[PDB]
Amino acid sequence: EAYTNEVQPRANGQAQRILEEARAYKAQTILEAQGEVARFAKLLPEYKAAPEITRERLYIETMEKVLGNTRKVLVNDKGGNLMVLPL
Amino acid sequence: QYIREAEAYTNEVQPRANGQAQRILEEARAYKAQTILEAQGEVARFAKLLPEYKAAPEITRERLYIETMEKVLGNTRKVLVNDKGGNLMVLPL
Amino acid sequence: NRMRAEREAVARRHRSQGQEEAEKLRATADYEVTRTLAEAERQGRIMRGEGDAEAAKLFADAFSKDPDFYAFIRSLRAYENSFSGNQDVMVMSPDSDFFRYMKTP
Amino acid sequence: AKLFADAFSKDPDFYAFIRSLRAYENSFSGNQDVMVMSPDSDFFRYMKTP
């Protein structure tokens, strides 16, 4: 006696642990989902107001970001030569 | 003395082998138990997620696809070079 | 010196045999941990699926409105995320799509 | 495999889609794996003028 009566607590605590743990992910998932859902539900009405302008600004803005970090070449076309030079 | 030491070594290693045998035997059982239980969890995820995909296949596929691409793209060396110029080298290490 | 050996052999046997039992019980302990670890992970996946499954209906309707604009804003964001590092090289040309006002008027 | 077979036979294409996507991140986790993309590439579609 008293051997099995102590095994259960160990698992019991761990069981409630995962429950709350997974419930947090689901709670955060729902929350984050709603936030992202609301994020696009606010840009879509304004996007429809001026699709070309919003697309152009986002595109030009997105471009200066990627280009700002990544290197550039701007080499003329019709030439099949480059050095990947990886590591 | 070589014989005396030899008998000790033989008698010493034999019990150790038996103990190692149970360890690999038990590990296989644990693997079997872990794989069956792990499969059940994944099955539930797929079963619950499948109706959501069936509701909006294109949106779900597109959302997952873009998300998936971003991660694999972020941890790799993108090139973004016109396929015309297929003159490259491997340079392995 | 022969008597020493025979007792010494028996001694190692008694010492080595006890070690063997340790291995047996030690291995069984590992199995119990694996039985509970997988069990917990199973319950987690069930709930962890409901989470993304519950949000999937939300994303579905939000982006169903305009999946082309959502893919555009999401892909633009994904580029900034993917190209966050300086390990890539954008081989463009002065007449590319972006480089439209880079020419003389 | 029994559970996988029954649970995935409901929709083979969708399981392949989800499983194929997950496999990519597990393999390309390291930066050593290079990807020679192109502007024409299907994914890099919105990176151009709208």
Author numbering:
A (entry chain XW): 269 to 355
B (entry chain XA): 263 to 355
C (entry chain XX): 225 to 329
D (entry chain XB): 280 to 329
Reported in the publication:
Among AAA proteases, FtsH is unusual in being membrane-anchored and thus positioned to degrade membrane proteins. In Escherichia coli, each FtsH subunit consists of a transmembrane helix, a periplasmic domain, a second transmembrane helix, and a cytoplasmic AAA module and zinc-peptidase domain. ATP hydrolysis within the AAA modules of FtsH powers substrate unfolding, extraction of membrane-embedded substrates from the lipid bilayer, and translocation of denatured polypeptides through an axial channel and into the peptidase chamber. In E. coli, FtsH partners with two additional proteins—HflK and HflC, which contain SPFH domains, forming a large holoenzyme that extends across the inner membrane and into the periplasm.
Notably, the HflK/C subunits in these structures form an asymmetric assembly, similar to a nautilus shell, with a passageway to the interior of the shell. These nautilus-like complexes were purified without protein overproduction using an affinity tag added to chromosomally encoded FtsH. We refined a ~4.4 Å resolution cryo-EM structure of the DDM-solubilized complex without imposed symmetry, revealing an asymmetric HflK/C complex resembling a nautilus shell with two internal FtsH hexamers. HflK and HflC share sequence and structural homology and were difficult to distinguish in the 4.4-Å density map of the DDM-solubilized complex. However, after signal subtraction and local refinement without symmetry (see “Methods”), we refined the periplasmic portion of the nautilus structure farthest from the membrane, which resembles a hat, to 3.5-Å resolution. This structure allowed visualization of side chains and unambiguous assignment of ~110 C-terminal residues of 24 alternating HflK and HflC subunits. SPFH domains, present in each HflK and HflC subunit, formed the membrane-proximal sides of the nautilus chamber, but only 21 of these 24 domains could be modeled. The entryway into the nautilus chamber was located near the “missing” SPFH domains, which presumably adopted multiple conformations, or were proteolytically truncated. The final model, which had good geometry, included residues 79–355 for most HflK subunits, residues 1–160 and 191–329 for most HflC subunits, and residues 31–97 of the periplasmic domains of two FtsH hexamers. Notably, however, the bilayer curved inward within the complex, whereas the bacterial inner membrane as whole curves outward. By contrast, following purification of FtsH•HflK/C without overexpression, the nautilus-like cryo-EM structures presented here, which were determined without imposed symmetry, revealed an HflK/C chamber containing one or two FtsH hexamers and an opening that could allow membrane proteins to enter and be engaged by FtsH.
